[PDB]
């Protein structure tokens, strides 16, 4: 339950990995928040 869930945000794709990176910085901090 460490390496295994470490995995999940280290695989991605490039560009769904970057969109996902940008993501989790404004998560739920754009649509309506800050």
Wanted: hydrophobic content about 45%.
């Amino acid at each position: 339950e460490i390496q295994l869930m470490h995995n999940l945000g280290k695989h991605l794709n490039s560009m769904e990995r970057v969109e996902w990176l940008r993501k989790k910085l404004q998560d739920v901090h754009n649509f309506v928040a800050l």
